[PDB]
Design a protein around this nucleic acid. Structure first.
Lengths: 69, 150, 121, 42, 124, 142, 221, 110, 53, 88, 360, 53
RNA sequence: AUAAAAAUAUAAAUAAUUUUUAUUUGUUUUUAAACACCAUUAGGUAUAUGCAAAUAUAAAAUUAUAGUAAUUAUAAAUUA
RNA sequence: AAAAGGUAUUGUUGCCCACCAAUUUUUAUAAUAAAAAUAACGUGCAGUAAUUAAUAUAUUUAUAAAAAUAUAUUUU
């Protein structure tokens, strides 16, 4: 049964981004650093004051291509 | 129109073609029907040699066109007189004339018309454009003035 | 259920409302009215059907009159009820009798069987 | 397992599991729903 | 009290349903007006459809089977498919044949008196 | 639905799963069914901040719920109907509704539960147990 | 059957679909999935007897051939413009009713002469079901019930020496909402291409005030 | 149909197995079905059911002493009029008739 | 043509819906060369859909 | 027995084989002749046909005329392969 | 000559045909499943009244006159003449009411045009869809309240009654079109579901319907299984017609009710006011009652001139009141259904009864 | 239209009688002019060559 | 041991309510008309009038006629 | 020079498969009953895209795994 050659290690094409969204690292570093047992990276010291924009959802979840995300 | 009937016929004698149409139209009027446009065409050399009961493939056929208004089931009646007549080779039977495909809602706009204008014929050109424009202008000038005669 | 929504009762089952169905026993009605069967586990109900016996002295009701039925002292082996009112008389039916026909045509088919009864002509 | 029992994709909310149990026999009891037909208990 | 307020609001709703029934009637009459205009129009143009009654079909059949009678001081017209059919003469004789078909017709009927059907020249 | 074998949905079910799918698709406006307790749930969700706003256009059928987002994820973390069925109404005892705001000794008005009382009002469990009346279960949300 | 495994079989790649069957569908005609955000009478988009989705051709404009077309969607994204308002037929005055507005305004992007959300987009299985033939290029039950005809048949024959219905004043009822400020009567004020006032909450019992709060802002209209 | 299409849960794979049934299990159950069909076709299995019988309680015509294939076993007890009907009809299915709707005529029918 | 299993499910589902939601995937039985023109009077010469039979 | 002319044994050739009809000018193929090309003066018919055959090859028409004419496949397999080709 | 027998062979798919293979044409049963090899004479007359072409009845003419006498007077002066303004539009309140011709061509429009055009657009060339729809509009015209309502019970019932007739006439001509089986079946289910509100809102129209479309088989209940416990009746309930009665204007609502203080029944308050609520009784219910009316005349003519036989049956009964089973009255004695009140005692001891239950 | 013209025998039951006359309407494309929206890639490579030539 | 062959028609039928036997899901009449298929030189069969529910999922682990063993099915790794 | 599968899991000298012997155990005992377990001998080599591709349904066929045929379908 012939499946795609490299299929076995294909990425999950809808949830492969979400690990990387800046909001995930904001949510995930906010607590890592709130614990008080961590020394926040220099990018957190900044993108804490300037958190990313709110409504830049990826087309993989907003299933709408005509959408200027 | 109600129905069009293209009757390809064998170029018999003008006693026989006329008599075919005499019995055909008389069959229509015995079958509560109407005729609009009994066009004729001189013989022509079709793409299929048609065979009667004599099995002879006749490559030249005189043509009849007959548009008609009938009863839609008297249609079934007259057509099986026609096809069984010993002289026709084939009648294209068009029910689609009242309602062609490009339309659709107003139903007269096609029923009034004839086949020669539901089916644009091959001969026509870009001249019948201005020709139909003048035909309409100079019919619709008096189309009301004339009806209001009686 | 419907009964306790419409009538206050002294003891359950006293008052029952139904489509009188079946009266062919002279002066006797069969009133078909429902109760409440609650399923605790599911958290839901289903009210249920029951062909009763219901005396009707003087033979008024016809099959279908929505009637009120009340309980009493017994009336026979099986009728502990009596036709306590009408809520709607099947006026179509009453006129069907007056004209003469059957106040209700009878079911087209019988009870479900297991034999392929071959009716031809 | 085209012929296996269904499994929840995720655990149900335990609060909903509680809220669906205000109308079951073990609360009909302590409402008073039954009519004690026998001696009941000794 | 709620009885009176709902009684009221529903009498109004019934009135508005009637009013719509009436505006709807009016709109149907306007429909029939614009349908008269459109339809009287296509019915004059149908007065022109020259219908052939039973008493006149026995003449129109001769008149139409006589559309190309082998000799005519005009040019003859086309077909529903628009060729120039082999202009016959009488009682079934193909006596005038165009040039797209003479070559083939005489090759297969070697002994027919065939004629190259000359259309009516525009020059004269 | 059609048969016996189907659960009987309701506007309260479909409004909850309209909203669930839109917060899962990062939409903004949903056109959500309109029954008295559907916009009941919506007015209290909006009071509880789970929704950037709603609007009743008096559209006899629909009304629009504008959703609120935060850090990329929906503010309505989860939203469930009290009943995946309509034929099963879950009346909440006032004690049932008092044992939700009591998480192991910590008073917790976090998860908001919408229940429609006997007075034909649609209220959260917090005002329902501040007046000790319990209502039909409509939705859970948080 | 032989009731015991004859094979030392151990295949190791378990498809996410085989595990989480509560989420993905591998039956054909169930790929449409759970669409609660349609309009249809179901949430199970594969049970909607209505609009069978052509799968090879659609999707150029809507993402995938599942999702509803951008002229039928019931839920709208943020930066994606929601539906345009069907203007009156003639559409000469949709720019004349901004005569109150800045003189040079262009056509409004949220206006349309022919926006119909019951417009059935063409499906190949719905209207050209090639199932019952060899699929030879000529066969197929082509159904001409959906597409607006391109023939000159129509505009030729349905031409009238009278005028059009727009002149005949045939049409009662005008606009369904009665008196709309952009199409019937002149639009005064500003346009709102967002919904910043439509999604506004009454802060007054008489509703003389309406509110619209973000997180750190508050808009009092 | 009175026949059982699947003699076995051919479709059994993990839910979402995007097919009716894997070719393995299909072969297993086609072997069970080849055994069943050869059992029937080789013991010359014949059943029957006639009108105004309880159509669920089948008739075993191959269990009739006039059409018996075994010798030490006793097939079944059947009323005489019904027996003369059935076994005459089994003989009647021994040929297909030209001038009627034809039929699949097998050796193992006789 | 079997990564378009769901494109043949669509035009099977439609032809079903016409066939009263029953004969999903059923197709019209092969008749003949001469089916519509030699068969006798009373038996449907042009193959009906499936759900007619 | 009676074969269509696209069948293998179309024009059988043996003692008993018979081909119906006449074959001059008007042949049995009067209305069944796809591609005639009038020869220009002296032009090579090794060019007329070496073009006809390439056209009817790129148009995969000879594909089909060979295919369907030899073995009347299962409609399933004919669909399978034709769909396979449209798809590929 | 005997029940048809199919010879099922288990190794095969399904049986062979019967040797008395009785039918040839499958016989077309109703909505609930009973045959018709053709439609009633009413419906064949309703086919000849559909294929000859219905003419608009003169009721519309006369109502137009005594309704709009000014448009009629205009027409009255304008009769015959080529009209350039439609003085009949209020006569044809809708496209569909102009079913007397083609294309909704009202009669008073074709005057000046050719007689051949009048022939073209007359009832003679109406298509068959045209003619069916013509009958449909004519009937929905005379059964509807206001000429825009097409959703009244009578409207819908008559429309679907004509509809199901044309369907059956289709079928009893062409048998294997079974999508159309499921056309007629569901359509008839709805026509029944409408007539079973008609005969609850005003049955007069209902019977005019019954006896003009001759369809009682689509009301006739099918399965006794249901209509034993009254479910074929529950439908006019479920739709909301349990109270669409007007007894205040048919059946004098005074005695149709018991009392609450007394507890007495409908017929007993009708006793204590002197009113006669009782159906027409069939001859059986008549003769049983006349017989129950003469038992005391029998007692008076029995004990008085044959007090020997009076005494003879005295002896017969007087021994029997002591013989037999029981002589005192206990609950065990007179529980008013022994066999089912005592289940533990019916197969072994009390073999008088062969079953534990005989009544509800 | 084709299978009615062929029914009445006013199109060849097989063939294309109007082929070269029809060629004037059919858009001669892969000869000189480069319709950039062609799906022939031989054409595009002729042109890439010729202009690289 | 003859083989040449079977193309046409659109609108158009409203939805919600109890048909649980009713209907219904690919075996069809006829070569004296053939292809095909099967057997074999010496034939039959040669294709939707009875008959005949049945894939399109309402779900509680495989087998097994609902008593037998302790499970079985499965997909992407690896294969000149 | 470029794209390919496994019922095997160092893997085709790999596995399985059926009829073919005793055995056993329950039983709805159709030539010889049906099913569960098993580890002989023998005909073969029927499945692993596998030697005329496989899978479901059905007509016919038969030493057994199966085949001709007619349908679909790709777990080819």
């Amino acid at each position: 049964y012939k499946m795609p050659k490299n299929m076995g290690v294909a990425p999950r094409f809808d949830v492969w981004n979400e690990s990387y969204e800046p909001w995930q690292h904001m949510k995930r570093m906010g607590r890592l650093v709130g614990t008080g047992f961590y020394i926040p990276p220099e990018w957190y010291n900044h993108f804490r004051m300037f958190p990313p924009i709110n409504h830049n959802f990826q087309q993989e979840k907003t299933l709408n291509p005509r959408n200027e995300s | 129109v109600f129905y069009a009937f293209v009757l390809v016929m064998k170029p018999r004698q003008r006693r026989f073609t006329s008599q075919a149409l005499r019995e055909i139209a008389v069959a229509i009027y015995n079958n509560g029907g109407l005729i609009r446009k009994l066009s004729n065409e001189g013989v022509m050399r079709p793409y299929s040699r048609f065979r009667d009961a004599d099995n002879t493939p006749l490559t030249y056929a005189r043509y009849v066109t007959l548009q008609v208004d009938m009863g839609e089931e008297q249609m079934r009646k007259v057509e099986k007189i026609m096809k069984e007549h010993q002289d026709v080779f084939i009648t294209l039977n068009l029910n689609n004339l009242e309602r062609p495909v490009g339309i659709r809602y107003f139903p007269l706009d096609t029923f009034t018309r004839l086949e020669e204008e539901i089916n644009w014929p091959p001969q026509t050109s870009a001249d019948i454009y201005k020709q139909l424009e003048m035909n309409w202008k100079e019919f619709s000038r008096t189309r009301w003035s004339n009806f209001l005669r009686n | 259920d419907l009964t306790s929504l419409i009538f206050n009762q002294p003891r359950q089952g006293s008052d029952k409302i139904g489509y009188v169905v079946g009266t062919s026993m002279l002066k006797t009605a069969v009133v078909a009215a429902n109760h409440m069967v609650y399923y605790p586990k599911f958290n839901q109900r289903v009210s249920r059907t029951s062909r009763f016996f219901a005396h009707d002295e003087d033979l008024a009701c016809v099959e279908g009159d929505l009637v009120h039925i009340k309980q009493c002292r017994k009336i026979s082996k099986y009728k502990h009820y009596y036709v306590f009112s009408i809520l709607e008389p099947n006026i179509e039916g009453r006129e069907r009798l007056k004209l003469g026909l059957k106040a209700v045509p009878p079911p087209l088919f019988g009870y479900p069987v297991s034999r392929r009864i071959v009716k031809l002509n | 397992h085209r012929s296996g029992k269904a499994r929840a994709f995720v655990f149900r909310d335990p609060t909903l599991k509680m809220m669906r149990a205000g109308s079951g026999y073990q609360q009909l009891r302590r409402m008073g729903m039954p009519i004690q037909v026998s001696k009941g208990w000794r | 009290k709620k009885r009176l307020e709902a009684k009221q609001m529903t009498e109004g709703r019934q009135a508005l349903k009637k009013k719509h029934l009436d505006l709807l009637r009016e709109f149907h009459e306007r429909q029939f007006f614009f349908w008269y205009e459109r339809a009287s129009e296509r019915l004059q143009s149908m007065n022109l459809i020259q219908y052939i009654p039973q008493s006149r079909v026995q003449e129109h059949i001769e008149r139409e089977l006589d559309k190309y009678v082998a000799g005519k001081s005009e040019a003859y017209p086309l077909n529903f498919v628009g060729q120039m059919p082999l202009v016959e003469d009488r009682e079934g004789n193909i006596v005038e044949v165009p040039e797209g078909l003479l070559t083939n017709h005489v090759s297969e009927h070697p002994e027919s008196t065939v004629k190259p059907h000359q259309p009516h020249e525009s020059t004269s | 639905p059609r048969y016996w074998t189907y659960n009987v949905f309701t506007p309260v079910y479909d409004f909850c799963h309209r909203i669930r799918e839109a917060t899962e698709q990062r939409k903004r406006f949903v056109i959500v069914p309109s029954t008295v307790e559907t916009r009941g749930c919506a007015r209290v969700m909006l009071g509880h901040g789970l929704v950037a706003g709603f609007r009743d256009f008096h559209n006899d059928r629909a009304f629009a719920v504008e959703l609120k987002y935060f850090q990329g994820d929906s503010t309505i973390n989860v939203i469930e109907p009290c009943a995946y069925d309509g034929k099963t109404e879950f009346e909440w005892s006032p004690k049932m509704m008092r044992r939700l705001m009591n998480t192991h000794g910590i008073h917790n008005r976090l998860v908001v539960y919408i229940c429609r009382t006997a007075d034909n009002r649609v209220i959260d469990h917090i005002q329902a147990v501040k007046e000790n009346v319990g209502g039909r279960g409509l939705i859970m949300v948080h | 059957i032989k009731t015991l495994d004859v094979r030392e079989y151990r295949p190791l790649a378990t498809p996410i679909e085989f595990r989480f069957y509560q989420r993905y569908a591998n039956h054909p005609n169930r790929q449409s999935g759970i669409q609660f955000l349609t309009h249809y009478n179901t949430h199970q988009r594969f049970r909607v007897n209505k609009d069978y989705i052509d799968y090879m051709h659609w999707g150029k404009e809507q993402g995938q051939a599942r999702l509803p077309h951008r002229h039928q969607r019931v839920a709208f994204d943020f930066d994606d413009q929601l539906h345009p308002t069907r203007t009156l037929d003639n559409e000469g005055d949709s720019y004349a009713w901004c005569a109150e507005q800045d003189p040079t305004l262009g056509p409004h992007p949220d206006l349309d002469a022919s926006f119909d959300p019951n417009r059935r987009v063409f499906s190949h299985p719905e209207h050209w079901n090639k199932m019952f033939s060899k699929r030879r290029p000529g066969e197929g039950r082509i159904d001409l019930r959906v597409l607006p005809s391109q023939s000159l048949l129509g505009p030729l024959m349905e031409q009238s020496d009278t005028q059009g219905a727009a002149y005949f004043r045939y049409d009662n009822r005008g606009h369904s909402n009665g008196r709309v400020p952009g199409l019937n009567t002149p639009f005064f004020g500003e346009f709102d291409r967002k919904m910043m006032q439509a999604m506004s909450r009454p802060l007054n019992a008489d509703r003389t005030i309406t509110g619209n709060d973000g997180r750190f802002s508050k808009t009092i209209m | 149909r009175w026949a059982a299409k699947f003699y076995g849960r051919v479709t059994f794979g993990p839910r979402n197995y995007p097919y009716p049934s894997s070719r393995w299990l299909a072969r297993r159950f086609k072997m069970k079905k080849h055994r069943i069909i050869k059992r029937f076709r080789f013991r010359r299995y014949k059943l029957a059911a006639v009108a105004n019988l309880p159509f669920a309680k089948m008739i075993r015509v191959g269990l009739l002493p006039e059409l018996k294939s075994s010798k030490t076993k006793k097939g079944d007890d059947v009323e005489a009029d019904l027996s003369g009907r059935l076994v005459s009809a089994v003989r009647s299915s021994g040929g297909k008739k030209k001038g009627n709707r034809g039929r699949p005529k097998s050796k193992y029918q006789i | 043509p079997h990564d378009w299993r769901h494109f043949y499910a669509q035009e099977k589902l439609v032809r079903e819906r016409q066939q009263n939601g029953h004969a999903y995937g059923r197709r019209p039985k092969q008749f003949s060369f001469g089916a519509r023109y030699v068969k006798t009077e009373g038996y449907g010469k042009r193959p009906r859909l499936p759900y007619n039979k | 027995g009676g074969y269509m002319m696209y069948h293998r044994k179309s024009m059988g050739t043996m003692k008993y084989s018979k081909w119906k009809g006449a074959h001059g000018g008007v042949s049995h193929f009067y209305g069944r002749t796809p591609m005639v090309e009038e020869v220009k003066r002296n032009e090579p018919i090794t060019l007329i046909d070496r073009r006809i055959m390439h056209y009817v090859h790129r148009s995969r028409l000879r594909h089909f005329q060979l295919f369907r004419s030899y073995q009347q496949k299962s409609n399933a397999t004919e669909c399978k392969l034709r769909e396979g080709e449209m798809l590929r | 000559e005997h029940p048809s027998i199919w010879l099922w062979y288990p190794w095969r798919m399904n049986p062979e045909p019967p040797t008395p293979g009785m039918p040839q044409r499958r016989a077309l049963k109703n909505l609930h499943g009973a045959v018709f090899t053709d439609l009633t004479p009413v419906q064949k007359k309703r086919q000849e009244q559909m294929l000859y072409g219905i003419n608009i009845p003169e009721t519309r003419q006369m109502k137009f006159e005594q309704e709009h006498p000014l448009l009629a007077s205009a027409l009255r002066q304008l009769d015959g003449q080529p009209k350039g303004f439609p003085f009949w539009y209020k006569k044809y309140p809708t496209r569909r009411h102009a079913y007397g011709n083609r294309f909704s061509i009202p009669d008073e429009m074709l005057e000046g045009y050719g007689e051949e055009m009048k022939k073209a657009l007359s009832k003679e060339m109406m298509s068959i869809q045209e003619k069916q729809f013509a009958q449909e509009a004519m009937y929905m015209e005379r059964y509807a309240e206001h000429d825009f309502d097409t959703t009244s019970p009578a409207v819908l019932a008559v429309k679907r009654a004509l509809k199901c007739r044309v369907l059956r006439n289709h079928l009893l001509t062409n048998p294997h079109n079974n999508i159309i089986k499921a056309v007629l079946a569901n359509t008839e289910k709805k026509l029944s579901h409408a007539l079973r509100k008609l005969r609850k809102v005003d049955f007069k129209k209902y019977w005019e319907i019954i006896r003009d479309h001759d369809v009682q088989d689509v009301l006739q209940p099918s399965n006794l299984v249901t209509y034993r416990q009254g479910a074929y009746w529950k439908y006019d309930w479920n739709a909301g017609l349990a109270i669409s009665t007007n007894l205040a204007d048919v059946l004098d609502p005074r005695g149709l009710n018991g009392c609450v203080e007394t507890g007495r029944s409908r017929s007993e308050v009708a006793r204590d006011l002197g009113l006669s609520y009782t159906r027409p009784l069939q001859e059986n219910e008549k003769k049983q009652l006349s017989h129950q009316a003469l038992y005391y005349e029998r007692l008076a003519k029995f004990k008085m001139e044959q007090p020997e036989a009076a005494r003879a049956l005295e002896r017969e009964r007087f021994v029997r009141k002591f013989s037999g089973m029981f002589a005192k009255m206990d609950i065990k004695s007179g529980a008013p259904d022994f066999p089912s009140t005592y289940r533990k005692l019916l197969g072994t001891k009390v073999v008088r009864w062969a079953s534990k239950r005989h009544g509800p | 239209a084709k299978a009615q013209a062929v029914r009445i025998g006013l199109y060849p039951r097989f063939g294309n009688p109007f082929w070269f006359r029809s060629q004037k309407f059919r858009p001669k494309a892969y000869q000189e002019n480069y319709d950039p929206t062609t799906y022939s890639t031989k054409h595009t490579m002729e042109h890439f060559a010729y202009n690289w030539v």
